[PDB]
Design a protein around this ligand. Structure first.
Ligand SMILES: *C(=O)/C=C/c1ccc(O)cc1
Length: 122
């Protein structure tokens, strides 16, 4: 239930949008190409994005352009390709929002066809 948990993908594997909105950290589920599958309440609180509005949109191309870099998007693609996405790093979100320092945790989902992007303020 906590950010950075070693088995976080197991816990969240069953959750629907409802339980996902209950997390203390931002949670985004993306497919291989980075299209948004799920986007919870906590993430919305940090970025101002309307969940219903971003579902279906491409995270790296349209929603979060500042993440289009080797340091974020680069690693997402490496993980999709290797099949073992799992990395944590510091990042700053600043597109159409006050510059906000966060800690990010990307981790492949158990379904093997989706990927998680977790975020919390620092
Ligand atoms: C940089 O522009 C990041 C923007 C952003 C990150 C995460 C989100 O959920 C929404 C926008």
């Amino acid at each position: 239930v906590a950010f950075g948990s070693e088995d976080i993908e197991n816990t969240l594997a069953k959750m629907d949008d409802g339980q996902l909105d209950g997390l203390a950290f931002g949670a985004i589920q993306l497919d291989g190409d980075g299209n948004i599958l799920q986007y919870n309440a906590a993430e919305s609180d940090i970025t101002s994005r309307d969940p219903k509005q971003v579902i279906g949109k491409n995270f790296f191309k349209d929603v979060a352009p500042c993440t289009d870099s080797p340091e974020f998007y680069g690693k997402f693609k490496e993980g999709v390709a290797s099949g073992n996405l799992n990395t944590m790093f510091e990042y700053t979100f600043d597109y159409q929002m006050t510059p906000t320092k966060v800690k990010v945790h990307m981790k492949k989902a158990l379904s093997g066809d989706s990927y998680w992007v977790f975020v919390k303020r620092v």
